[PDB]
Amino acid sequence: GLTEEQRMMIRELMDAQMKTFDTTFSHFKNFRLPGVAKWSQVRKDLCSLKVSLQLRGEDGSVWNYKPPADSKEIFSLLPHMADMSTYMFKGIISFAKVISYFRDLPIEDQISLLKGAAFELCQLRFNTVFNAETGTWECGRLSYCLEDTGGFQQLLLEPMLKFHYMLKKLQLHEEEYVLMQAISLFSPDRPGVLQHRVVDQLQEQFAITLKSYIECNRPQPAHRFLFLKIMAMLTELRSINAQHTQRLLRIQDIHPFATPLMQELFGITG
Ligand SMILES: CC(C)(C)c1nc(-c2cccc(NS(=O)(=O)c3cc(F)ccc3F)c2F)c(-c2ccnc(CCS(C)(=O)=O)n2)s1
Known part of the structure; x- marks a missing residue:
């Protein structure tokens, strides 16, 4: 059984998630769409996550976008992805900002922790709209469908994609997703945090709450070691976070595309 501090911790996380996660993407509107030496690495960076895009209209109409082959056609999806990223980051x-453990930290550590974890929290939220049968992220009227490559194996060669399939296969509850979000957010070892002992204590408590929630609610033999599998996924997700930071910075060096909010989050000055 969870203690009262633990049940309350979960309720606060769950409430924050309910208030700030637009699962139907109803408020993502007026976003950009693809028009009607270092460069070899940028080519490698871009052609590794090909998605077609689908856009269903309230009236029943469907728009469908298929991406181009690398033959600057590589950049055609970046303004849209920047708008989607910005919406998610908000x-x-x-x-x-609605979590009390987070509001109570000094404002500089708030900033440092957000810059450390925004990508990871974004991937965690996206996993809950990921469909592993069809290979697609279902974002309300938007859909992002993985392109036929190689097969599912070759898709699993990409770390973001292997992460999404492997995280989906664990069939987490909402509680577990939200606790994963808090653990990743309260990472005491992000560049520029000052209250590292406070943040470490909070993280330890989130982790223990999660282990206890699993121990109280998931008895079936398939859930043995579930807690440790989740912590290994968070470790993987930090690895992916760092590779993607460098990926983004390279692309940004060649082809400016980041929004003001992304510039702030990734430490770009102007
Ligand atoms: C599920 C789905 C399909 C919606 C995706 N989500 C993300 C995702 C997840 C978390 C954060 C960000 N944002 S981000 O960290 O700022 C960022 C980093 C970066 F390296 C490049 C652009 C960025 F915007 C994301 F974009 C995707 C992603 C990841 C990497 N690269 C690309 C380009 C694909 S493309 C143009 O088709 O080649 N897209 S795909």
Whole structure:
């Protein structure tokens, strides 16, 4: 059984998630769409996550976008992805700002923790709209469908994609997703945090709550070691976070595309 501090911790996380996660993406509107030496590495960076895009209209109409082969056609999806990222990041920032453990930290550590974890919280939220049968992220009227590559194996060669399939296969509850979000957010070892002991104590408590929730609610033999599998996924997710930071920075060096909010989050000055 969870203690009262633990049940309350979960309720506060769950409430923050309910208030700040637009699961139907109803408020993502007026976003950009693809028009009607270092460069070899940028080519490698871009052609590794090909998605077609689908856009269903309230009236029943469907728009469908198929991406181009690398033959600057590589950049055609970046403004849209920047708008989607920005929308998600806003959701993430709101999430952090309504959690009491987060509001109570000094404002500089708030900033440092948000810059450390925005990508990871974004991937965690996206996993809950990921469909592993069809290979697609179902974001309300938007859909992002993985392109036929190689097969599912070759898709699993990409770390973001292997992470999404492997995280989906664990069939987490909402509680577990939200606790994963808090553990990743309260990482005491992000560049520029000052209250590292406070943040470490909070993280330890989130982790223990999660282990206890699993121990109380998931007895079936398939859930043995579930807690440790989740912590290994968070470790993997930090690895992915760092690779993607460098990926983004390279692309940004060649082809400016980041929004003001992304510039802030990734430490770009102007
Ligand atoms: C599920 C789905 C399909 C919606 C995706 N989500 C993400 C995702 C997840 C978390 C954060 C960000 N944002 S981000 O960290 O700022 C960022 C980093 C970066 F390296 C490049 C652009 C960025 F915006 C994301 F974009 C995707 C992603 C990841 C990496 N690269 C690309 C380009 C794909 S493309 C143009 O088709 O080649 N897209 S795909």
